[PDB]
Amino acid sequence: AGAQDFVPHTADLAELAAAAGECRGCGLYRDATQAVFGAGGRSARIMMIGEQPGDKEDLAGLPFVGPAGRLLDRALEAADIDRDALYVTNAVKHFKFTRAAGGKRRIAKTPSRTEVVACRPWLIAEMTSVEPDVVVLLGATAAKALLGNDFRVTQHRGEVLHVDDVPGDPALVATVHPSSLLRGPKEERESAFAGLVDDLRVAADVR
Ligand code: SF4
């Protein structure tokens, strides 16, 4: 099933990342430039999971390098969370996209639940390798990957969650994806930014 046979029997993140470059667990490896594995080290206490690598990530080979990554950096700084404590990754590891004539970027397309479930073996390997105390789920795709396809991020803000089939029973905090805070009226963006900082502080205060 899915990516499972492509995942080697190791918790070494460099070896896992190299193996993900050879993954054919769903169709997304075909058009993407490369797999984008998570970044950070196994001592990280906080793991953060987004949806997928975007246009800039697909070419950088690293998660959270675009405008949404810069906004997340601003929120992490505001939450007094250092990168040293972080392992950051995405629910799926290959960019799914299309282009529009006149566009200034490749347009991210939503991974199907089928793709998320196919790629989940990599997320499980990362979680087994890092043993985080807390997992921050950025957006619906990531939150549903671990909490269920019916899960609604909008209904559980600020809440520390724990589910049974997650490796190591870490705390889980589901929040908005930073990409959503880039647009909208100023007062709504400012209120949303504050709520993202609040959710990051909840996660950082676990244990
Ligand atoms: S998105 Fe995940 S399962 Fe699909 S080919 Fe890429 S690494 Fe494999």
Author numbering: 2 to 208
Sentences from the paper on this structure:
UdgX excises uracil from uracil-containing DNA to concurrently form a covalent bond with the resulting AP-DNA. Structurally, UdgX is highly similar to family-4 UDGs (F4-UDGs).
Substitutions of His109 in MsmUdgX with Ser, Gly, Ala, Gln, Cys and Lys showed the loss of its covalent complex formation with DNA but gained canonical UDG activities. Both Cys and Ala mutations of H109 showed intermediate Kcat/Km values. Further, the overlay of all the structures of UdgX H109 mutants showed that the overall structures are very well conserved with a Cα RMSD of ca 0.2 Å. When we arranged the mutants in the order of increasing cavity sizes (left), we noted that the canonical UDG activity of the mutants increased with their increasing cavity sizes to begin with and then with a further increase in the cavity size, the UDG activity declined (right). It suggested that the initial increase in UDG activity (H109K to H109Q to H109G) occurred because of the efficiency with which the water molecule could be localized to make a nucleophilic attack on the C1′ position. However, a further increase in the cavity size (H109S to H109C to H109A) perhaps destabilizes the bound water, thereby decreasing the UDG activity.
